[PDB]
């Protein structure tokens, strides 16, 4: 698909201590590359991917500076939304924010976005036109009008159409051999007996990137997605992914069922069968 640079902010108040905690994680597509934790000793923005490590201190000082300025603002922001909702000052609450840019085929902004949530619920969002906001309730409308009064959107827009897509291009270059080439799944099938009239076949897909795959079971060209056990795609721990699909067939009919794997790392889609 089209590539994307994204950042996730998490601000959690800790009315207990007098403070709050602040997280940033940076992603290019589904690959984490930077992180920030306000609770880390002498906290700064840190590399989280081998290919970003080559950045100079001038890069890290800037991101670190921006992280702490943002972390300080959110210290008050938590108190503000609390007051917006007339909530007690005892409970720990959370604000989340995601924003980023998609790269178009012309090397320009395809689409830009920002969305914010409070305590797990949609709060405010930047519109596709990048010149206006949509608020989900009253509290967010107070916030919406403030950002209209100082024209927050125009700073966001100049960022998204410029700096965001530019750095994205660079990151795609820096990490081209992990980001930009597809990694095909390592596939095999296993057999697991249940009872007299039940044998479970499990089709494995391991170490693939990107995250998007298709796993299906067919019975003589006939879909079995109805009684197929399929798991949520899971991280391998190295920037690649795992998934499996299973179904219970009769102890005689192993060869009558085929697993079909489709992933962009694959040249031709696969049909697998137990041996």
């Amino acid at each position: 698909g089209p590539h994307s640079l994204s950042y996730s902010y998490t601000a959690v108040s800790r009315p207990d201590r007098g403070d709050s905690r602040f997280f940033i994680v940076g992603y290019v597509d589904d690959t984490q590359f930077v992180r920030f934790d306000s609770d880390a000793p002498n906290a700064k923005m840190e590399p989280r991917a081998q290919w970003i490590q080559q950045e100079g201190q001038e890069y890290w000082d800037r991101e670190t500076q921006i992280s702490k300025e943002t972390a300080q603002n959110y210290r008050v922001d938590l108190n503000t939304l609390r007051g917006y909702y007339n909530q007690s000052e005892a409970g720990s609450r959370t604000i989340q924010r995601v924003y980023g840019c998609y790269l178009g085929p012309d090397g320009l902004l395809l689409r830009g976005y920002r969305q914010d949530a409070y305590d797990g619920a949609d709060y405010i969002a930047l519109n596709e036109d990048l010149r206006s906001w949509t608020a989900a309730d009253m509290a967010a409308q107070i916030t919406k009008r403030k950002w209209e009064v100082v024209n927050e959107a125009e700073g966001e827009r100049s960022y998204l159409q410029g700096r965001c897509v530019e750095w994205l291009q660079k990151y795609l270059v820096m990490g081209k051999d992990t980001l930009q080439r597809a990694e095909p799944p390592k596939t095999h099938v296993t057999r697991h007996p249940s009872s007299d009239l039940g044998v479970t076949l499990r089709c494995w897909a391991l170490g693939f990137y990107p995250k998007e795959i298709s796993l299906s079971w067919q019975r003589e060209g006939q879909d079995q997605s109805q009684d197929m056990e399929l798991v949520e795609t899971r991280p391998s721990g190295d920037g690649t992914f795992q998934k499996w699909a299973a179904l219970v067939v009769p102890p005689g009919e192993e060869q009558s069922y085929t697993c079909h794997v489709q992933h962009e790392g694959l040249q031709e889609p696969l049909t697998l069968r137990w041996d």
Binding site: R62, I66, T70, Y84, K146, W147, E156, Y159
Partner: peptide
Amino acid sequence: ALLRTATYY
């Protein structure tokens, strides 16, 4: 690279 805004809620 991060966006440099510090606009309160």
